[PDB]
Nucleic acid binder design. Structure first.
Ligand code: PNS
Ligand code: MG
Ligand code: MG
Lengths: 69, 111, 115, 217, 242
RNA sequence: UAUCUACUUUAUUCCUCCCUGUACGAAAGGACAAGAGAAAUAAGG
């Protein structure tokens, strides 16, 4: 129902690997905010919205629209 | 100088309750650094506002413009803009409803 | 120039704006000495029998040169204390809100785009 | 040869020395910044510094819909719709906070002023922001794009039907009645095309200006 | 003499060429009138004793005009003086320290950028106008209309002075002064350009050349065009606000 | 449908900011002045 299987957890762990490269901010509120972006959203959704939210996960990973420091 | 490092010094020296900044890329021509920070209450956010304008005003940068604290009368929100950066002192509930951390990372990719 | 009685195209994610209503939202008061509002002024506004403060984001009469000119009277709602009602603003917002004296920093955190 | 309209003065009883001075400053700006040939149909993208951002620049793309103004203070206003919203900006051509003016699609429309695009369908006014500059060949006249647009209903910005406007880029047949057309032919002024004292001949003006151009080189 | 604190110097008479924009380094337009100095000269010096005024006076005239169209007293005046006759002669109140010999050219670089200046000219005459255009509007026991009542009548064609106008740029070659904002009068009108009387600007005559500017002095000659510090010159790189 | 008299070119204010959150008070409180701004009106272009 998402774009694929491995891609979702790949982007997840990739955001965590940027989560340790985070430098200035409270990293646990950061990680809890990653949770609330992923826990309450990625449970019981239609297969189309899975695509769009993994695409905003893609863009949130890349950070050409800004990056958390 | 008064950099974002100095801002981290001012806010962790105040012990701000919650910190999350975004480096705004130069195309989206608002600012460079977008600080989102919460505190205890109106007294806390208010006092740390007067603290950071106190330290910027007292610190350096005479030729740079004096900076007005916005929303002194409202309770939950407070915001202060500089040359490079803009800080938003608010409440984490107010943060929950205005969801700014999503916006400045997802410019067209959110609600 | 957005005076009294002008029809107003509200740009918000607000409940008051995007709710359908039989009357178009129109201005009632302008908070200047002359009753003429420009980009970055506060007005009273009648939405659904509810008067409400509002902030003018771009109008249709031409201003200075390098600034933009819209094809409607785009207006963002605001509350009495000064924080806006809205959550997202879709239509582009001029950067000319930055220099003016007043509550503008709150609104510029909300814009999708900037013109 | 293409001489941009800002160099040709409007007639008037001002002194030619003042335009000597203005043209001197205009060419001294045209050393630094490259001002290209563009008409009133062409799609432009302009990079400007921002007085509100700290030395950040910006890009606006649209249609040049008017080339008004003469001299150093001359403008062009370009239009685009984005986010379901129409925006126009008056750009001063010699304001030193403009960095480049790239011509995406050099083309001439049927009219000299496309202000009627405010009342056309928004599809006739929308453009891609990241659209690529189409390549023109060096030695050729310009593509005169004709496109009789479609108009939104009757309460327009101005009565474009009236023959004082001389609008050519309208499919009037779709959006106007024959009775209202024949009503609009009341304000015709057929003599006005035929008087020889209203005709401002810019020919020797063009000569002295092209020796101003060559002498600045 | 050198400049003493409290002394006044000469003004000018200039054509109004027209207007043009001028952008400063902060990216703001300033509409600027050009004022060409055409054949300005000092015509007669009268001391305060012969004037019976409070101060000495210099008569200065501009824009050479036909000898075939003047009264013979005027032609005798200019004949003895040794000049072709000027169109207007304006009179400057002046201290003894600034008194150039009658018959000397005044140039554009008498003023320098940064200096503030007052300009007087006849306003554009609108002829007989009524109350709505002239004054901008529209007792019983008083059986008469007070003096100075606002009524229709001849509008314009009167001397008015715009006070405190910044000089932005002077062009030494063509003798142009580029002054801030608007000056009274139509194009090609003659204006009287003196240093400003505004008391915020009464002491900045330190750096101004005190009798007048003399190119004949040959000391450290001037460029094409003096600019004020804040003026974006043409030919400078396109300005960035970083 | 104007006969007579008379007549027909005699700079303020608000807000912001700073000084200063100093003076003053003892805490609460909290200046002036002068300065920069942005507005608005009037006056003159
Ligand atoms: C795919 C999976 C079942 C994998 O979890 P695991 O228990 O197999 C679970 O992580 C999931 O439901 N992810 C959905 C991803 C998604 O659609 N995100 C956007 C929410 S609209
Ligand atoms: Mg209209
Ligand atoms: Mg009486």
């Amino acid at each position: 129902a998402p774009w694929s299987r491995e891609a979702v957890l790949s982007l997840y762990r990739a955001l965590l690997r940027q989560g340790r490269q985070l430098r200035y901010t409270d990293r646990d509120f950061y990680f809890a905010s990653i949770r609330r972006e992923f826990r309450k959203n990625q449970k019981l959704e239609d297969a189309e919205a899975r695509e769009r939210q993994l695409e905003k996960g893609l863009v949130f990973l890349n950070g050409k629209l800004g990056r958390i420091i | 100088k008064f950099d974002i490092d100095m801002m981290v010094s001012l806010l962790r020296q105040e012990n701000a309750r919650d910190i999350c900044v975004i480096q705004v890329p130069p195309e989206m021509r608002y600012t460079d650094y977008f600080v989102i920070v919460s505190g205890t209450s109106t007294r806390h956010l208010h006092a740390m506002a007067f603290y950071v304008v106190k330290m910027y005003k007292h610190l350096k940068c005479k030729r740079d413009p004096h900076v007005k604290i916005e929303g002194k009368d409202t309770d939950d929100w407070l915001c202060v803009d500089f040359g490079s950066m803009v800080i938003h002192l608010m409440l984490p509930e107010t943060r929950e409803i205005y969801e700014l951390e999503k916006l400045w990372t997802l410019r067209s990719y959110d609600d | 120039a957005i005076q009294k009685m002008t029809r107003v195209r509200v740009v918000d994610n607000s409940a008051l704006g995007n709710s359908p209503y039989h009357r178009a939202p129109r201005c009632i008061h302008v908070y200047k000495k002359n009753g003429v509002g420009k980009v970055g002024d506060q007005i009273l506004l009648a939405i659904k029998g509810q008067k409400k403060k509002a902030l003018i984001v771009g109008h249709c009469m031409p201003g200075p040169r390098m600034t933009p000119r819209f094809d409607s009277n785009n207006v963002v709602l605001i509350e009495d204390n000064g924080n806006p009602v809205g959550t997202r603003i879709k239509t582009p917002i001029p950067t000319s809100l930055r220099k003016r004296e007043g509550e503008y920093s709150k609104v510029l955190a909300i814009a999708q785009n900037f013109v | 040869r293409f001489l941009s309209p800002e160099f040709i003065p409007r007639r008037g009883r001002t002194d030619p020395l003042k335009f000597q001075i203005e043209r001197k400053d205009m060419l001294e700006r045209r050393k630094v910044l490259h001002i290209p040939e563009f008409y009133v149909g062409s799609i432009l993208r302009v990079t400007t510094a921002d007085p509100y951002a700290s030395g950040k620049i910006s890009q606006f793309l649209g249609i040049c819909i008017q080339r008004s103004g003469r001299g150093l203070g001359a403008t062009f206003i370009l239009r685009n719709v984005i986010e379901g919203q129409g925006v126009e900006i008056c750009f001063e051509l010699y304001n030193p906070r403009v960095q480049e003016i790239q011509v995406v699609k050099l083309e001439k429309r049927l009219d000299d002023s496309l202000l009627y695009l405010r009342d056309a369908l928004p599809e006739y006014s929308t453009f891609d922001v990241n659209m690529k500059p189409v390549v023109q060949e060096p030695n050729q006249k310009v593509p005169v794009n004709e496109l009789k647009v479609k108009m939104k209903p009757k309460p327009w910005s101005k009565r474009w039907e009236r023959p004082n406007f001389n609008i050519k880029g309208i499919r009037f047949d779709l959006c106007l009645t024959e009775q209202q057309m024949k009503e609009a032919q009341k304000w015709n002024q057929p003599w006005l095309e035929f008087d020889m004292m209203r005709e401002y001949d810019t020919s020797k003006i063009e000569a002295a200006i092209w020796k101003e151009i060559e002498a600045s080189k | 003499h050198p400049w003493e604190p409290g002394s006044f110097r000469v003004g000018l008479i200039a054509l109004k060429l027209g207007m043009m924009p001028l952008w400063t380094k902060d990216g703001q337009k300033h509409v600027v009138t050009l004022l060409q100095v055409q054949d300005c000269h000092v015509l007669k010096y009268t001391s305060k004793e012969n004037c019976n005024g409070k101060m000495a006076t210099l008569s200065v005239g501009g824009k050479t005009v036909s000898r075939f169209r003047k009264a013979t007293s005027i032609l005798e005046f200019y004949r003895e003086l040794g000049l072709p006759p000027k169109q207007t002669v304006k009179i400057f109140n002046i201290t003894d320290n600034a008194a150039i010999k009658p018959g000397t050219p005044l140039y554009a670089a008498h003023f320098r950028p940064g200096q503030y200046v007052d300009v007087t000219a006849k306003t554009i005459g609108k002829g007989f106008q009524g109350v709505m255009k002239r004054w901008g509007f529209k007792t019983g026991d008083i059986g008469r209309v007070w003096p100075g009542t606002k009524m229709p009548g001849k509008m314009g064609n009167i001397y008015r002075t715009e006070y405190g106008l910044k000089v932005w740029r002077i062009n030494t070659k063509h003798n142009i002064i580029y002054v801030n904002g608007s000056v009274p009068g139509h194009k090609n009108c003659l204006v009287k350009v003196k240093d400003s009387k505004l008391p915020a600007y009464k002491d900045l005559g330190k750096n101004l050349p005190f009798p007048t500017y003399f190119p004949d002095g040959d000391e450290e000659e001037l460029p094409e065009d003096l600019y004020d510090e804040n003026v974006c010159q043409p030919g400078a790189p396109s300005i960035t606000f970083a």
